[PDB]
Structure formats: C-alpha cells, structure tokens
C-alpha cells in the first residue's frame, strides 16, 4: 500500500514514541504533554493511560501480556503499567542518562538505550541488577529492538548507522543502511524486517533480512519522523513529531 | 565563503556564543564541557566547568562571563572571568532548560523549555521572573538586543516571538517556512538570526523588514545555535557535522 492514513488522536504535542499490541491497540508517548495515550483498533476517542510524575516520555513498548513500557526522559527513569493496573512500578535500572528507547523480547528482557551514556542496558525479568550490552562506538543511542531470535537493534543517531547484536554475540555488525542522516527510531517485526526512522532526511526505510538493499516507504508529509512500530498485519505506525501526528501504512 | 573552525574533539554540539574580542565558545553537548577558541587561534581551552548533564545552551556577557545551560540537571552555572568563582544561578522549578542569554545589564535569561515558558534573574537576585510570553510551544532558543527586547524561538510552533522590555504584548515575527528552528541570535542593527534545523539553513531578518533572506552556508546538517559578532560575522553549530562553521558578514 502507498496510501498512509492519520490515527485520530487528539491534542498531540511533540509525539515521539509508538507501540502497537496483538490487538491493534496504539500507544503513543506525548512528549510535550507528559502522557501516554492509546486509541483501540476503530476507535476515535483516545485515553490517557493512568502514569504519574512522566517527564518528557520518550519511548514506548509492549508486550504480549498488555504491559506498556515507557522511558521517562526527563526523570531518567523507566515505568511500566501492567494491564488492567493503576499503579505503575519504575523498573530497577540504575545510573540512566536520558532514557531514549525501550524494547522488550518474548522472555520478558527489558532493554534501554541510554542515550546520555553511550549504552544499551538490559534487565532480566524479575532481576534487580542491570546488564550492558556488548556494544561499542554507539554515539548517541536513540532507538532499539530485539526480534524473535534475540537480536538487539540499535540506531546510532551521533554516527549515522543502525547496528545489531545476535544473542550470545559480541561481535556488532552494521547493517546495510545507506544515506542514513540521524536515526531516531528502530522496529523489527517477526519476519526479520528492520524499519528505520530517518530524522534528518524525513523518510522511513526498511531492510529485509539478508537484504543489502532498503527500501523507503511510500509515506507522505513526514516531518521528522521519531518512532517506528509494525504489526502483526505489517502496518508499520509513525510518530510525526514535526506534524503533531501518527500515521500508519499498510 | 564560509570557514570551519579549528575545533577538535567535538561530540553533537548544540551551543555557540562570541563575546567581544572574538572568542567564540561553543557547548560540547555529547562531551558535558563547554570549550572556547580564541581569535586567530587553533588549539582549544576546555572551561572549568565541573559536573554538566548533557548541556545545551551557552552565553557570555560584556565582562567574559560565561552562561551555561546544564540541561539535565535543570539549571544553569555561571562563570566569572576575572576569577575561577562559578555559581549556579538561583533558578527555580527549572525542567529540561535549552537555551540562555543575557543582556548588558547583566540579568540572564533561560528558556525553560519543559515548562513552555521563559524566566529570567536579575544581576545579585534571588528571585525570578517569568516572562509574560502566551503560548509556547516547546521553545528552544531565546536571546535579548541592546534595548532589552527577548527573542524566543517558538520551536513547537515554527515561528520566532519577541517581546520588548516591559512590553506584556508579543509579536510573531514574519518569518516564512520554518521548520523546528532551534537557535536565534541578535545584533547591534537589529538583524535576527534564526537557526532553520529541519531545512539545514540559516535564515536572517532584519528590523522592520517582512521578507527574510537565507545565508550563503553549504554543507550544514541538523544545525543547532547560531551565533553573531560585533562585525556582523556568522557563527553556527554544525551539529550533525560536528563542528562550528563561520560566515564573514
Ligand atoms: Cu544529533
Ligand atoms: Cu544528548
Ligand atoms: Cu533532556
Ligand atoms: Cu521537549
Ligand atoms: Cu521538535
Ligand atoms: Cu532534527
Ligand atoms: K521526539
Ligand atoms: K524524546
Ligand atoms: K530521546
Ligand atoms: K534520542
Ligand atoms: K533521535
Ligand atoms: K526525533
């Protein structure tokens, strides 16, 4: 499909983040509100989902049990709200530089990008301590995403690149990207497709697996697009940050 | 023809200021320094700052003083030239702050950007005053002229607000086609300078004028501050480049 549609949300201000559950439901953090909204699959009225004390909500993400996830920027904190809860639990991650993006894998490993600290962190379900990720150069990590196989994808807004790290690997790899002009967000979805957010260049590219050559996605009016998420269908949802605005492609 | 200058070791620059005999300072922001350049010089100093959290904006006074924006720890640090003394600014209720100014008579200005609102303090106060501004939208940029007029760039709304001294009434500036500006400047004739960042230009424009005009810079990715000096020269934040370019002017 080459015809995106405009989620009707409303009273958006600077949206960076997007996630998208089994049911179709989208969340979109609200950087300039201090929120998080979500809109179910035909819907027309949002809701605000019941956080307290967000600063400058950065990234977002769910899981298969309808916990959301949120990276709290401006408290360099990460929340989380389990479903049907009114209570949130900020998850025990230490020594967090400006929280840009989150991401959480089918065992329930939960992993940060840490922009301020050139990072990528993770914790285990249930465990108090934190890990970082054997990744090395990252400049200014903005986005990540881990696939079925345990792969973490990273963007690297300071150089440019988007790079990836298979499980039990410490070994990084840079995929084939081209003309990459500051990443912001990352998605993969369980066919091993990997979509990128291009800021700098206002466009959104994807990469099929073992592909060296991507693809731009036929979006329209982009203005600095900041987050990427895709479907169980392969809709791939955009925060347009410049526009106040999420859309999504068939 | 434009010049980039003989910086080393930059890491996502957000921040430039010059001060009167040409020293351009510029905020290191992927490093938390603030380094300096002299005039005609080629190897940099790194300011006395201590503990900075992803600084974004950088000023200086008629007396050297330097102003920077410690962004992730909400406030602002102030550092004398005669002396080593620094002072963080008594600021109140500061959330995720971008830019900083100050005029001749010593009273800073900082762009309280998670709070949609600019603030200043008086030389010797402790007590701030919120500028009476009406509707920003996530601003970013903020700078004040000879005759006490501030200058905020209405980054969320892609426009550039001014405000005079002891005026309760804002002006949006007829600029055309902005998108996301993020730095402004000012000089003696009353030019503003604007950092268009979602075009990749600077575009300037002068007192009374309605119709603005774009500087001559090539090669500029993502810029971010933008600064002028006594001559009329340009200085810009090459942030995506990593480096601060110049246009004599
Ligand atoms: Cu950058
Ligand atoms: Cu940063
Ligand atoms: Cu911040
Ligand atoms: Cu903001
Ligand atoms: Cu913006
Ligand atoms: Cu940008
Ligand atoms: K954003
Ligand atoms: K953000
Ligand atoms: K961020
Ligand atoms: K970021
Ligand atoms: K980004
Ligand atoms: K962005």
Redesign the pocket.
Known sequence: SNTQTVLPFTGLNTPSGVAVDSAGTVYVTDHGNNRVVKLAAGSNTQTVLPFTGLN?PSGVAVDSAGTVYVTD??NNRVVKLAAGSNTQTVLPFTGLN?PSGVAVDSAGTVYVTD??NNRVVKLAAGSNTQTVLPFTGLNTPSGVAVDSAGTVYVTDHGNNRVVKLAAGSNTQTVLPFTGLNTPSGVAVDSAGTVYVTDHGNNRVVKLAAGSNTQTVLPFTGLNTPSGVAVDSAGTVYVTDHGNNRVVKLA
């Open positions: 400058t920027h401006g400006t922009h301020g």
